[PDB]
């Protein structure tokens, strides 16, 4: 009899001051807010029901109305920022944190879920949830010798909520909160559930999306080898955040990049750079570009792993945004590499797919490619073989492209293209 109530009826029951009438109206609200097609969230809000739901969270004597109001508030909080804000403005945050200590597992889980929605709205609500003290009782729910004894859905909700506490920037989460959470994240990163693993990887990807000090906090916990293992998973929902995390780490120092290499990550990149999912290829190529921006011994490990032909591959055919990251990978390679490494790059066939991308109507990739050509010619000057490279570029139609580019519109495109022709084709 709690199916398809009007908002007016729900208000009538909740205002009745009959606890059981209130419980049935709250359950009716929960079923309303649980429907797929446009749940009347805003009408529930405007009816003034949120403070009453929040008050019901504290009725320890009537656990069913705690659960129903928690569920109703969870679904309101899952909406827009204004809808989440209505939940927070009703005082729900400390009331949900108190519910984390509920002896009923289905009620504390609902509190975990609700706080995940609130924290996931943005850094302000994330930090407000942290200021109200949510981290200690959340982590206490995971203080068991073996995570496998916890209910699967329960563990998945805790992991997801912890990942939202790690999420968002400007500002990033408080350093103290990250250090408090990280040891539990590391443990969840070794759990056997694919959804726990995915959300753990997402959390790590958030924490590594920042300056080197943030990256260092994660790398020092020793998780890179486990991230690399998850890089090789068959589940795309795991590979995607694992790769994002690895890519974030290699934006840091050369020493942090070396940990990724030392863990064996380059051996997975043959598959990643030919992955059928466009986003994986783009992220993997972007990651490669930040590795080819490292030291020469790191460029050398890219060579040793046979990854240069795979870079030639993505430059030759891929989604355009992937080809753009490949261009960056080549320019970084040629800027920091030895002469021998640059020679090997030409021997693997980089010139023709480089020239073909000068037809692209993207002015930045043109500058990137022109830079790489300059870098390759500079290595050819040290060998006295600029002529043979000029013939190569002409034979594949590149010279026609480069001098079409002297009539280009954007400044350093035409300056660089004249400098090439004046110096090597004249």
């Amino acid at each position: 009899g709690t199916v398809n109530w009007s908002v007016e009826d729900i208000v009538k029951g909740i205002n009745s001051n009959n606890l059981e009438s209130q419980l049935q109206a709250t359950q009716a609200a929960r079923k309303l807010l649980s429907r797929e097609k446009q749940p009347p969230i805003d009408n529930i809000i405007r009816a003034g029901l949120i403070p009453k739901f929040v008050s019901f969270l504290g009725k320890t004597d009537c656990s069913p109305i705690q659960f129903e109001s928690a569920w109703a508030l969870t679904n309101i909080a899952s909406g827009t920022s204004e809808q989440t804000k209505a939940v927070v403005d009703g005082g729900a945050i400390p009331a949900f944190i108190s519910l984390l200590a509920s002896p009923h597992a289905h009620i504390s889980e609902q509190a975990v879920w609700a706080l995940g929605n609130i924290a996931g709205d943005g850094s302000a609500f994330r930090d407000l949830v942290i200021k109200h003290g949510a981290i200690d009782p959340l982590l206490a729910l995971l203080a068991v010798p073996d995570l496998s004894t916890l209910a699967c859905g329960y563990l998945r909700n805790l992991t997801w909520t912890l990942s939202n506490l790690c999420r968002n920037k400007n500002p990033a989460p408080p350093l103290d909160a990250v250090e408090q959470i990280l040891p539990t994240l590391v443990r969840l990163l070794h759990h056997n559930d694919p959804e726990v693993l995915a959300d753990s990887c997402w959390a790590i990807s958030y924490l590594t999306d920042g300056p080197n000090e943030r990256i260092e906090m994660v790398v020092k916990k020793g998780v890179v080898p486990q991230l690399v293992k998850l890089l090789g998973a068959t589940e795309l929902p795991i590979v995607t955040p694992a790769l994002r995390a690895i890519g974030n780490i290699v934006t840091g120092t050369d020493e942090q990049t070396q940990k990724v290499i030392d863990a064996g990550a380059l051996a997975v990149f043959p598959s990643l750079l030919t992955n059928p999912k466009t986003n994986i290829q783009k992220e993997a190529t972007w990651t490669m570009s930040n590795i080819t921006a490292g030291r020469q011994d790191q460029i050398q490990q890219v060579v040793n792993h046979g990854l240069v032909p795979f870079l030639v591959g993505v430059l030759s055919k891929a989604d355009f945004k992937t080809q753009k990251e490949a261009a960056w990978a080549i320019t970084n390679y040629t800027s920091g590499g030895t002469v021998e490494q640059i020679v090997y790059l030409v021997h693997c066939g980089i010139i023709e797919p480089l020239m073909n991308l000068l037809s692209a109507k993207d002015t930045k990739i043109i500058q990137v490619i022109l830079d790489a050509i300059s870098n390759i010619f500079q290595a050819a000057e040290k060998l006295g073989e600029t002529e043979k490279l000029s013939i190569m570029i002409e034979e594949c139609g590149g010279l026609d492209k480069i001098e079409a580019l002297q009539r280009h519109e954007n400044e350093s495109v035409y300056k660089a293209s004249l400098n090439l022709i004046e110096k090597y084709f004249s």
């Binding site: 797929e36 969870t74 899952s78 909406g79 879920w113 929605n117 996931g120």
Partner: peptide, 6 residues
């Protein structure tokens, strides 16, 4: 990311 419970 936010998640409603259906």
């Amino acid at each position: 990311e936010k998640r409603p419970r259906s």
